[PDB]
Amino acid sequence: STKETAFVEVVLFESSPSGDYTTYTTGLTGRFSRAGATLSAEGEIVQMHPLGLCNNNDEEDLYEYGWVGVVKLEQPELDPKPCLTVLGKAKRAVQRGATAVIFDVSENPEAIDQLNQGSEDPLKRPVVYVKGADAIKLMNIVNKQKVARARIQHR
Amino acid sequence: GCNRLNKKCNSDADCCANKEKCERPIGWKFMYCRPDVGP
DSSP states (O other): OOTTEEEEEEEEEEEOTTSOEEEEEEEEEEEEOTTSOOOOEEEEEEEOOHHHHHOOOOOGGGOOSSEEEEEEOOOGGGOSSOSSOHHHHHHHHHHTTEEEEEEEOTTOTHHHHHHTOOSSOOOSSOEEEEOHHHHHHHHHHHTTOSOEEEEEEEO | OOOOTTOBOSSGGGSOTTTEEEEOOTTOSSOEEEEOOOX
16 A cells, blocks of 8 residues: 555756746655556656657657656547557657656546556566646646656655 | 756756756755856
């Protein structure tokens, strides 16, 4: 229950012409899914958008080192034919260099069961899901469309 | 313009001149660019 809790801290800066700066900090919790490793991770957040995630190409241009991917899942009734399964989306982000992947499963709770199937070998990086108030916290900062950094801790 | 805030860095040369500095946040593993208000 409290096992597999993922503690996520996100930090974003906003500057101003005066040179004054605002820091926005959030702490939130989700869960390490059985689809991935239970490991700490840290890096710049990249929100993974739908067509970009569908890009099937194998090219160096698509690789970036050490980022934390964020995927906000759509309601299944509105996205009935995805290009990849939820597990496939995690695998694809890891192939493109993600150090961890966070799914906001609020609109697709069934994704939790897909991620928690332990019948596949785990990805080597954390695959975390957030929902409810914690997902609201994450997306509030992700939606600012700036460069945020995130740290994922186990225990 | 220039804004490298929260980008990874290995030295101040990787951040924006003067208004940013490269620092490892306490409790974090890596160095990132952060604001430098002088001091």
